[PDB]
Amino acid sequence: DLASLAIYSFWIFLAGLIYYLQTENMREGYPLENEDGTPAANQGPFPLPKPKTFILPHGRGTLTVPGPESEDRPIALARTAVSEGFPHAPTGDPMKDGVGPASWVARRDLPELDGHGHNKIKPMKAAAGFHVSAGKNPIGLPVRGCDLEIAGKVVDIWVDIPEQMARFLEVELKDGSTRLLPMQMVKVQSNRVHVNALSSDLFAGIPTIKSPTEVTLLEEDKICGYVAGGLMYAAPKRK
Amino acid sequence: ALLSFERKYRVPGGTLVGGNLFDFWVGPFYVGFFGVATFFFAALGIILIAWSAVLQGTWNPQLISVYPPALEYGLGGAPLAKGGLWQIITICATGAFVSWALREVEICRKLGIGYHIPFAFAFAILAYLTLVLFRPVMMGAWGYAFPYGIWTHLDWVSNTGYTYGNFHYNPAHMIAISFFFTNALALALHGALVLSAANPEKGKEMRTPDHEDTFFRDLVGYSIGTLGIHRLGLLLSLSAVFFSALCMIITGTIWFDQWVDWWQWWVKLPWWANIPGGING
Amino acid sequence: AEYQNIFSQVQVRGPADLGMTEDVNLANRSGVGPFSTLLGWFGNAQLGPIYLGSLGVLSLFSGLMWFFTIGIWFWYQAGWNPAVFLRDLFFFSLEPPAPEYGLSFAAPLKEGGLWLIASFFMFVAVWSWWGRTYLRAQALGMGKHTAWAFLSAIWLWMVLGFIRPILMGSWSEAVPYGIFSHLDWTNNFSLVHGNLFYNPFHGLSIAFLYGSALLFAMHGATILAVSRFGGERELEQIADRGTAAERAALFWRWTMGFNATMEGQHRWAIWMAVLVTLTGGIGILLSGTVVDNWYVWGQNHG
Numbered sequence A: 001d002l003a004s005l006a007i008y009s010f011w012i013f014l015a016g017l018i019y020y021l022q023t024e025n026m027r028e029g030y031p032l033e034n035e036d037g038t039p040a041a042n043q044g045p046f047p048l049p050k051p052k053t054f055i056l057p058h059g060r061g062t063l064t065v066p067g068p069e070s071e072d073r074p075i076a077l078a079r080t081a082v083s084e085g086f087p088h089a090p091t092g093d094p095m096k097d098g099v100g101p102a103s104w105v106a107r108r109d110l111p112e113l114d115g116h117g118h119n120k121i122k123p124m125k126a127a128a129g130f131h132v133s134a135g136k137n138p139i140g141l142p143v144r145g146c147d148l149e150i151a152g153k154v155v156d157i158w159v160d161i162p163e164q165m166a167r168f169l170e171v172e173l174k175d176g177s178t179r180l181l182p183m184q185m186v187k188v189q190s191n192r193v194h195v196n197a198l199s200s201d202l203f204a205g206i207p208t209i210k211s212p213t214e215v216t217l218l219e220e221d222k223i224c225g226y227v228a229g230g231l232m233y234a235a236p237k238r239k
Numbered sequence B: 001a002l003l004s005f006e007r008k009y010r011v012p013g014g015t016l017v018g019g020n021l022f023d024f025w026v027g028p029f030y031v032g033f034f035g036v037a038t039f040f041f042a043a044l045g046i047i048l049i050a051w052s053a054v055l056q057g058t059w060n061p062q063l064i065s066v067y068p069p070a071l072e073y074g075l076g077g078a079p080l081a082k083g084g085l086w087q088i089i090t091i092c093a094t095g096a097f098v099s100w101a102l103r104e105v106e107i108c109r110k111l112g113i114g115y116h117i118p119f120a121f122a123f124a125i126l127a128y129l130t131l132v133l134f135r136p137v138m139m140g141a142w143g144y145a146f147p148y149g150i151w152t153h154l155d156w157v158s159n160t161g162y163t164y165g166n167f168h169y170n171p172a173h174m175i176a177i178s179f180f181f182t183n184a185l186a187l188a189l190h191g192a193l194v195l196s197a198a199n200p201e202k203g204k205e206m207r208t209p210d211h212e213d214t215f216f217r218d219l220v221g222y223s224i225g226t227l228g229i230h231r232l233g234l235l236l237s238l239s240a241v242f243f244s245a246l247c248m249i250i251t252g253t254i255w256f257d258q259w260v261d262w263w264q265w266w267v268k269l270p271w272w273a274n275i276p277g278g279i280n281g
Numbered sequence C: 001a002e003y004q005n006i007f008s009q010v011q012v013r014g015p016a017d018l019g020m021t022e023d024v025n026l027a028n029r030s031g032v033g034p035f036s037t038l039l040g041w042f043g044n045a046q047l048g049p050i051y052l053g054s055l056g057v058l059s060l061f062s063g064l065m066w067f068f069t070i071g072i073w074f075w076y077q078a079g080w081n082p083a084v085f086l087r088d089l090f091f092f093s094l095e096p097p098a099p100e101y102g103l104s105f106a107a108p109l110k111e112g113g114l115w116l117i118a119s120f121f122m123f124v125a126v127w128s129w130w131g132r133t134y135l136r137a138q139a140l141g142m143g144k145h146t147a148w149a150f151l152s153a154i155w156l157w158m159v160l161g162f163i164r165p166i167l168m169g170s171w172s173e174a175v176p177y178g179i180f181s182h183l184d185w186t187n188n189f190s191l192v193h194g195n196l197f198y199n200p201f202h203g204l205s206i207a208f209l210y211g212s213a214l215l216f217a218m219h220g221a222t223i224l225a226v227s228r229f230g231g232e233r234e235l236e237q238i239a240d241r242g243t244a245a246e247r248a249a250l251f252w253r254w255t256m257g258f259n260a261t262m263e264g265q266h267r268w269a270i271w272m273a274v275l276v277t278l279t280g281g282i283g284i285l286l287s288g289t290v291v292d293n294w295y296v297w298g299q300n301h302g
């Protein structure tokens, strides 16, 4: 009868669908590797999908996945054990070296663009007609790290132009130079901006950007990476 | 055994209990202390369910079913074969879930991400504990809890619902269903938006969030935005589960008559109770 | 107080965004609506502009016509009295023709003709809105995923009010327009067919409904958890994987041993949700057309 045909067909459609979905989710990170960089023996039960090409939009190129994979960067870690499956110790300073929760990826060293081709993120000062509309305005507030020591002062907000959203605080140090802190990692309060991830002495270590009115995807990854890493790696200096 | 970008994240640290003792992976899987806890509770429970399966005399999983103590036991223990196995499996289940969440917390700390995933999972655990622990305790017996079997737990859903007429009339249940449906709405829209930007018309180039905002504004006059929709999905989800727990925590406890009749508070309000016409006059 | 990104701490406003122009006929976009500071703690503050071409005016008009048709009947049932109208809001109901009238349009106005009118207006509102769904995507050069997904919702709705009534040979099979009556219809549908818990399509539907809450909780949580790395900028994460996408994948891999890509997830999402009503629609459509009693059917499978 119809209903048991429909149900049986459906479990077949459903297994085909899980197959499609699982292979589609193999377009990044595959083929699997041994801890040493080498293709692993056991690739799992699903084959790689036939590749596909995204056309990027501002003469920015193509992406074709799956494709050859690589960190395009040195990984300062080493084995701590004699077989598969254990942690890999930082061979240096893990914050400086961009590993563990301080990791960053070798994203493209241009800025993300809006639909019109302009830089997506600008310091508010260069963003025409953009002003704070609600909430404590943090500009001018001292910035305090997890040691409860003051690390600098907020000197602008970097805003996403097409989505009208705060993305970073630009913070000035004793130095005179500035750093970006991710908006999602600061707490804005009446008389200060509080940063739990970092202690005051780790502010100078925040990756710097090359031009003062642009950030590249590569630069965002290093900054977000480094301050996220502080949660684990700043923990001895954290009151 | 590793995704091509995985090695750099696989560092020591993050753990909540045990320093570096269980700090390692098996294949793709992290292992908490809470990985070990999760295995112990899960395994014990599965054994105890396989055992419950033989004392009830079946091996097919559409029939296997483990019942709570009958009402007569109140909140007391009960022998293994007559609902104690259930009691212990329930302790194991709680053990395995709470463990799983806490393992999730460990993974979070190692990866330097926020706690949102385990926090969210905690709502599901609370829904479960509302059915098997909080509601029973407030009602005086394990026997009100639902049993562990594929088709038998549905039986319990019917019997519990129909003890109050059409359960539709539970107003907290109405709100809960609202959030489930809305959630699925948002989930369909969210997936289709992102995908329709990433896979445009053909030969055409990837669209942008600006396009996604533009499409939504064109269509309904408003777009919540790429941050918003993720806040939203999270909130609709969790809200659905919250109101699910609410609609059941209040059932058999503060309200125990037919849910349809609760609505009479509205109709019998002074200023219109006795006016004639309409359905209730 | 580590911050969670659930509400924004600082809102930022610039000139109203009029959006991308692609092949969209700009003559048909309203002007920008106001800016809600309320909404903007959670999402975007900007209301409008909306696009309103010909199909859009059709849709919105029959939509209202649907609504006022139900509404005069409701005031009628209140015998024109506002206090009775508010009192009995959820009890009023616009019912379809009785079985006597089969599929005919002969049924008197006051006894199901109004139902058919309301339904007619609802039919054109929904389908025209569907077309609007495709056309707004075409004008922007986007894939048709929204229209495809929405079609899946339309399937349940079509099956319930139009396709199943027709195959059963009468409109009395269709769902009434009312807050409580549609719940009664639903309960009664299940009772009359031997309990929808026995219908394996009903059970699948539940799994996807629950699954949608699972997934969206996972996904929204995951995105928020990696929003400290720009995670919500999913389109650029698709084009050029960042640490956000990586730490996300890797959370699910260490947790449950397999994972998604940033684009991949959205494929899981679109399907999880779409299968709720796909599955659902089949289950209803089969009910009483092929299976009178799910319990019974379940006892033989065939």
Ligand code: BCL
Residues within 6 Å of the ligand: B097, B124, B125, B126, B127, B128, B130, B131, B156, B157, B158, B160, B161, B162, B166, B167, B168, B173, B176, B177, B241, B243, B244, B245, B246, B247, B248, C186
């Ligand atoms: C005939 C029956 C009654 C009825 C009676 C009830 C009753 C009775 C109940 C509900 C509940 C619900 N009903 Mg009602 N309901 C009816 C009609 C409906 C209709 C409808 C279209 O008509 C809808 C949409 C709903 C919807 C709902 C939801 C609000 C809710 C179910 C979700 C939930 O609580 O999840 C929360 C999620 C969980 C509890 C899952 C917990 C998961 C745990 C933490 C993890 C497990 C891990 C697993 C073991 C590991 C697997 C191992 C590996 C995968 C291998 N009801 C009819 C009228 N309904 C329930 C509720 O509100 O619960 C509080 C409830 O008890």
Ligand code: BCL
Residues within 6 Å of the ligand: B046, B128, B131, B146, B150, B151, B153, B154, B157, C202, C203, C204, C206, C207, C208, C210, C211, C214
């Ligand atoms: C939530 C309100 C009611 C309830 C009402 C219903 C109703 C109504 C239905 C189900 C259905 C299901 N319910 Mg139930 N269910 C409840 C609580 C539970 C709990 C629990 C630990 O709290 C579990 C584990 C389940 C599990 C199940 C599955 C057997 C089935 C698919 C659910 C799903 O896809 O979810 C979404 C989750 C995912 C997609 C993740 C994958 C989940 C997998 C499939 C879970 C498998 C569990 C395994 C069989 C049992 C554990 C064995 C382990 C070895 C220990 N329900 C409470 C009591 N449940 C449907 C069914 O088809 O029943 C036959 C159905 O119609």
Ligand code: BCL
Residues within 6 Å of the ligand: B157, B181, B184, C125, C126, C153, C154, C156, C157, C160, C185, C186, C187, C188, C189, C190, C195, C196, C197, C201, C202, C205, C206, C209, C276, C277, C279, C280, C281, C283, C284
């Ligand atoms: C006593 C009640 C019966 C029962 C009877 C039914 C019946 C009857 C049906 C379901 C259906 C469903 N049931 Mg059941 N259900 C029961 C028990 C349960 C339980 C449980 C006990 O826990 C649960 C979780 C469910 C859950 C569900 C859902 C999975 C499924 C509906 C999917 C959906 O998204 O609908 C919502 C989606 C829609 C209604 C489509 C909407 C699309 C249209 C196009 C939107 C029009 C909008 C309109 C223009 C208004 C616009 C206003 C705006 C604000 C502008 N049922 C018991 C056994 N259930 C449905 C199903 O698929 O079953 C197989 C169904 O028909």
Ligand SMILES: CC[C@H]1c2cc3[nH]c4c(c3C)C(=O)[C@H](C(=O)OC)c4c3nc(cc4[nH]c(cc(n2)[C@@H]1C)c(C(C)=O)c4C)[C@@H](C)[C@@H]3CCC(=O)OC/C=C(\C)CCC[C@@H](C)CCC[C@@H](C)CCCC(C)C
Residues within 6 Å of the ligand: B038, B041, B042, B045, B046, B089, B092, B093, B096, B097, B100, B104, B117, B118, B120, B121, B122, B123, B124, B147, B148, B149, B150, B151, B153, B237, B238, B241, C210, C211, C213, C214, C217, C218, C221, C255, C256
């Ligand atoms: C916010 C609420 C929504 C939600 C969220 C949610 N669920 C989650 C998460 C989150 C955020 C996870 O991070 C976690 C996960 O890792 O998912 C992949 C998870 C999860 N939710 C799951 C299932 C699940 N979630 C459900 C619901 C929901 N989850 C809600 C709708 C349901 C429903 C709706 O029915 C189910 C069935 C798992 C896939 C996973 C948790 C896996 C886990 O905790 O593993 C630990 C334990 C075991 C492997 C062993 C089994 C335990 C044994 C002791 C025996 C069995 C006990 C008994 C209760 C059996 C009953 C039998 C049934 C027939 C009734």
Ligand SMILES: CC[C@H]1c2cc3[nH]c4c(c3C)C(=O)[C@H](C(=O)OC)c4c3nc(cc4[nH]c(cc(n2)[C@@H]1C)c(C(C)=O)c4C)[C@@H](C)[C@@H]3CCC(=O)OC/C=C(\C)CCC[C@@H](C)CCC[C@@H](C)CCCC(C)C
Residues within 6 Å of the ligand: B181, B182, B184, B185, B188, B189, B219, B220, C059, C060, C062, C063, C064, C067, C125, C126, C127, C129, C130, C133, C146, C147, C149, C150, C151, C152, C153, C273, C274, C275, C276, C277
């Ligand atoms: C895959 C399954 C899920 C799903 C998907 C889904 N729904 C969809 C879509 C998709 C993909 C759309 O693209 C479409 C959409 O545009 O979403 C925004 C839609 C849609 N789903 C909707 C509703 C809906 N979806 C539901 C469910 C679901 N849809 C499933 C869970 C439900 C449920 C669960 O019951 C409902 C009620 C709409 C928001 C929209 C369909 C729009 C449409 O067809 O509308 C025609 C136009 C009108 C009817 C105008 C009428 C307005 C009046 C009736 C209201 C009056 C009050 C108000 C205006 C007061 C303010 C005063 C003013 C005068 C100022």
Ligand SMILES: COC(C)(C)C/C=C/C(C)=C/C=C/C(C)=C/C=C/C(C)=C\C=C\C=C(C)\C=C\C=C(/C)CC/C=C(\C)CCC=C(C)C
Residues within 6 Å of the ligand: C067, C068, C070, C071, C072, C074, C116, C119, C120, C122, C123, C157, C158, C159, C160, C161, C162, C163, C175, C176, C177, C178, C179, C182
């Ligand atoms: C304040 O008062 C005023 C006057 C302003 C107005 C107030 C109005 C109010 C209060 C309205 C309330 C409306 C409500 C409560 C509506 C509820 C709707 C609900 C709950 C559910 C609807 C389910 C509907 C379904 C499933 C209908 C599907 C319909 C179809 C699939 C179309 C059927 C096609 C037909 C019948 C034939 C005509 C078509 C052709 C091609 C000939």
Ligand SMILES: [Fe+3]
Residues within 6 Å of the ligand: B190, B194, B230, C219, C223, C234, C266
């Ligand atoms: Fe997303």
